[PDB]
Design a protein around this nucleic acid. Sequence first.
DNA 1: CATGAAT
DNA 2: AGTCATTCATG
DNA 3: CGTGCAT
DNA 4: GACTATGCACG
Lengths: 689, 689
Amino acid sequence: KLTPAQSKNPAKNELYLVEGDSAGGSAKQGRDRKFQAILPLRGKVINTAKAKMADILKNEEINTMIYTIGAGVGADFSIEDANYDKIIIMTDADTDGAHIQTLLLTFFYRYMRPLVEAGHVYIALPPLYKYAWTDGELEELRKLQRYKGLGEMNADQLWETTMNPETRTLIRVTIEDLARAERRVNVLMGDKVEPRRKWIEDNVKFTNIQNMSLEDIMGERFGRYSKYIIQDRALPDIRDGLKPVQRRILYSMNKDSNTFDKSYRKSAKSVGNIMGNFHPHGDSSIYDAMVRMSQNWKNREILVEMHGNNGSMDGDPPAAMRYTEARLSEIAGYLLQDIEKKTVPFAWNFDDTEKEPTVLPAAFPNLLVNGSTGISAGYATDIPPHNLAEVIDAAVYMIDHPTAKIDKLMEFLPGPDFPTGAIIQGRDEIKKAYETGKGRVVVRSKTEIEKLKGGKEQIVITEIPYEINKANLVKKIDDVRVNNKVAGIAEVRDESDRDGLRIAIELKKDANTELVLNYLFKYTDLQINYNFNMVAIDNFTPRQVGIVPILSSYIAHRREVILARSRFDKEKAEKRLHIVEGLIRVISILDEVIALIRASENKADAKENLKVSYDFTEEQAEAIVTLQLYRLTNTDVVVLQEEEAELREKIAMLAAIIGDERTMYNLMKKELREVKKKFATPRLSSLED
Amino acid sequence: KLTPAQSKNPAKNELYLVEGDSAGGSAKQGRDRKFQAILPLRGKVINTAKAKMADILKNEEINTMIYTIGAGVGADFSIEDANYDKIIIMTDADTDGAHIQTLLLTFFYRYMRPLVEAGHVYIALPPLYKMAYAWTDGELEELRKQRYKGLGEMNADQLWETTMNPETRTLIRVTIEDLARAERRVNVLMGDKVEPRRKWIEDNVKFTIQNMSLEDIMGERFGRYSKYIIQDRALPDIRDGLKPVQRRILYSMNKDSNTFDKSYRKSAKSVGNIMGNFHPHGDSSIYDAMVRMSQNWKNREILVEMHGNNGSMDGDPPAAMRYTEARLSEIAGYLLQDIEKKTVPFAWNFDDTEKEPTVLPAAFPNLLVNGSTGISAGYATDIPPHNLAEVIDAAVYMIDHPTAKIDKLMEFLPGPDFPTGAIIQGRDEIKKAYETGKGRVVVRSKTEIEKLKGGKEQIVITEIPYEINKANLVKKIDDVRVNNKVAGIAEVRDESDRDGLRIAIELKKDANTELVLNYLFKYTDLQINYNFNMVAIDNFTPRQVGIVPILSSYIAHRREVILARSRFDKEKAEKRLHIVEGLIRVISILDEVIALIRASENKADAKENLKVSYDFTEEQAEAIVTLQLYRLTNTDVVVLQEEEAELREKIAMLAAIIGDERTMYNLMKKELREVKKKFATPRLSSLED
DNA sequence: CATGAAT
DNA sequence: AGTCATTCATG
DNA sequence: CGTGCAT
DNA sequence: GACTATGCACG
Ligand SMILES: COc1c(N2C[C@@H]3CCCN[C@@H]3C2)c(F)cc2c(=O)c(C(=O)O)cn(C3CC3)c12
Ligand SMILES: COc1c(N2C[C@@H]3CCCN[C@@H]3C2)c(F)cc2c(=O)c(C(=O)O)cn(C3CC3)c12
Ligand SMILES: [Mg+2]
Ligand SMILES: [Mg+2]
Ligand SMILES: [Mg+2]
Ligand SMILES: [Mg+2]
């Protein structure tokens, strides 16, 4: 796995720890083989502060590093009998690169302290533009090619920028204070989450060879990584309930006109467009997210319609993106409704070539309807799906009554509504969840006892808990029968066809079916505990939220959308109305206008003449001057006046929405009810206490 | 890997052999678990009538097919011990599916004869269309009163209802009518003898429940696969020298404006667009093809420029399409020159939503310049790269002298010009190759001797034979030292860097350096034999062609392109002249026309009046009537008469090309010389005899 | 045993 | 993101 | 131990 | 085209 140097020399030999096999290859190509060695770090280096000391020793990356370095580890470590003068960590210039640097540094600190204390650990700093490393260097170089990673850099460019000892700009790792360094590393990388959460809260603001400390290097790297994972990866926006990857998937597919009323496009075509325009990451990661939105046992209201093998409840792999074809679902269209009307904040992509929405208009409150999950850094998320009609009903009520209480809201939104059905138990815990954000509810399979011939009964499962694998469940129940942990099971039988779920647990003659069913509920996943952990992104910061701040954030959002949409349509109507006013007046003086253009020197002089001599505005003067010749035939002013009437009425009703809070909220309620009527579906999960 | 039936029954159990894992997964969901078992066949099945029996027994696909059939194989085959009553083969509707059916049928023939003789071996026929479903184009025509490209685009419920439901499926019963003729049919198609197969293809293939015989099924299936892979996969077109996948890559990237003058584009975005619009195959195959066109040690003139790790001469894996950026090279633009002018026959793609070029205009003879290779069915190709300037000079001569002899052409085209360089020996065999298509020439590494200290010498290799892996060569050379197959080798060192190839073979003190160098040339790969096998596609058929059928077919192609282009520009200039002629008349009667349009009631009326009153044509009247108002200012009649003159001359020069074979041929030469001057590059390979 | 578009 | 196996012609 | 976006 | 290991919070 390691590319070694030509000659052995522990006085000049350098070890390059490269992030990735591709970048490892590029390094291997652009290196100096006389003394430079390459070691690909395939994946993320294990946490040698969290993981056990056994599984740490059973790690491939760690072992081949301890072998390539050739000095041992822990207390059996002799820096004198090493193999390298310098060990350089070369990663991508992005956030995940900063995470690898963090993980690798904690390794070389916890188990190879003398190597770091002797200043033998370095950090290669690849350029960010093309050469510039900062924004100030770009400014000075302006008097560009943004490197998305090491993969986009050539071998000769790699050497000239970051590998040549005379040209490279390294960051030397030094231990200034062993006490403050021990504290920092142990907090950021410890098993305890709470000190890490607090550190992120207090520090991270969400708004040729230099030497850096350990505390500074661990702070700038884990600080850069934490902020990006919370804001721009794992956690959903509190409004549209989407992670950046899902929003980019829905938007790109919509921009490519890949909607529900059109033909399916090949998945790879969509995935490729997402990656080249908005989401600068792996094709597999994007596709796996695209597939999940097509699975109706993961989402209560699917956003993608996919043809072919997209998986099952048995958890078998979906067809590769070379096979499947996809398109947005009809209800996914409402998430993107009026996006063409400046109703949402847009920001530049990584490419700085095209703008992308930071949030979707969300004509329906997706965050509650579909849910989210949900593993960040310092924070985590688990929001269950809900009924489309019920959430809307609660939303409509809160629109009328902003200061509504949870007890009243639960008359409309009684609890979660899993797409997999099953039984939810714990009315008290549901309330606790809708208030504080956290809460532990019990999810139970829908069962039915069928009596067989011979005095023997049979348990028949028809629905299973959310996020539970059907195939793994059957195996676990069968293991109970095989091991005879409990007595009475004759045969476990998955009888689920393409049109129904059915797990049949046939029991022996004279066997307490109550004793068995109770055992399977406790020791298998027939019954599970579902933990609420409703955390989302409100105002760029992570926020644990109940049912109230969620609904309030959605209402506040839809208000902005409706207001912005109204300004947009009013802007269009005004501009035409202004043009129609001019055209009507033109007909009254058609002869003198044509005579004026006839006397004009050019297009610009013609418009300037229309302004001065006949008080037409710039916008009007443009429309008049660019009229096709045949429009001189028409002198019917009546039809244009009918358009004036229609436009003036539209501007009026639009302005009232912008000017009257009540009128606006009435509109919002009207649309939320239409969405309800169109996409209403009965409950699947029963509620008990 | 096998999904067994829930109930073992050698009377009703079916065994579906599915092409691919994903399709096997879809079948695993759409099956009836009571009696339908699934066995996914991953990749093409081994040719059991072509490979050594030792390799056959080691083939895991065969072993897992026998051990699940439960009846052994060969002479030790009890037909009553089988666990399945029916064995259905379910492949895609495409030609590769027909190949698998062929390979499988020969196995069940050779090693399981009683199984096929009992009529238990079936062939499942998937639907081809979906509007209900239809298997034939006639059935689609009747159903008219979704084109499936495989099984990966079908849902589980769809696959069941159409091909898996035993009461609603179309099956093919494989019956062996005669054991005599079926043997010759099997051996000719699958046997180790290539010549009889090539003859059978040239004799049968026209290049332009329900029972079925074995000889008929084998001929129909393999016939389709033979034809398809011959003219639509492995072999290049004789005109633009491109395989279908290479042509689709170039056209797609050019259509997406991913060219040399513009920014680089993420590779996955290009691959996805190709796969979804033109080339209905795997992403890796398309990307690998795209990567090769970027490697400057395989192509004499790269057609794709690529940023990042695109591999090396050591054979190390290039970066995945997630990492790399790419765009068309400048010279690749000349392959697509004038494609927007209907100079090339187009054809519908697989979606019938977009038309693709069947051949590129090719402003330079790409077949000889870049070469091709080169493994089809019944045929194979191997054309070496040539110098761009030399091939053009050869073609230019043949334009003036159609009946040019080979000995004369070689004064301009002396031989191949490998991008890897090295030495070519064998003037005689080159001529034999340029005449017949086949030839065996010798390629020798470029070496030099460097005197060292202590009286030692050092062999230095700077250039190596075409298509030779540098990493393996060094290993094989060093293996000579290790095994001491020749005396005097001290150390083998690859000293190549990012700007120079260098393999230093350091010798010992008193060692015969001439002896060492001679042994390596003969027993390693410092010297190899390049075998010409110039086979291309001429008139939809594979043709073993010499240097003359190639150059002539290119000139013939360039003729059609230039003729079709000249007609395009002429019709364009004609219609434009027609308008200019009318606009000049209008100026002299501007007021009368404006008054005439004002007097008119509408657009249609205005044109009829422009016709009747001033004899303007319909095309002329339309142009006048649709002029924007400001055009009444730009009333310069002279600059219109300049365009009029400029157009009449352009038509005159274009008509001369269409109406004179010589003037057209001079245009070929003029343009070919321009291409030559722009992309001229010195030889890299030296020639000897 | 490689080569290169396919599975 | 690398690894793993087969087709096909051919020396 | 599985979860779902990342390496 | 499936297989294999890491992060991160959490019962
Ligand atoms: C499972 O088939 C493949 C294999 N194998 C064949 C053997 C089967 C049993 C034991 N494992 C190996 C793995 C392989 F080595 C490579 C590829 C491959 O590169 C590829 C592609 O699209 O680029 C596609 N496929 C699938 C489309 C056939 C490959
Ligand atoms: C080599 O890393 C990966 C592994 N491995 C990690 C271990 C390292 C030593 C060898 N064995 C395993 C293989 C893996 F199991 C899965 C994926 C993976 O799914 C994936 C993706 O984009 O979808 C990307 N990568 C690469 C981007 C890191 C994966
Ligand atoms: Mg990266
Ligand atoms: Mg993955
Ligand atoms: Mg196929
Ligand atoms: Mg492959």
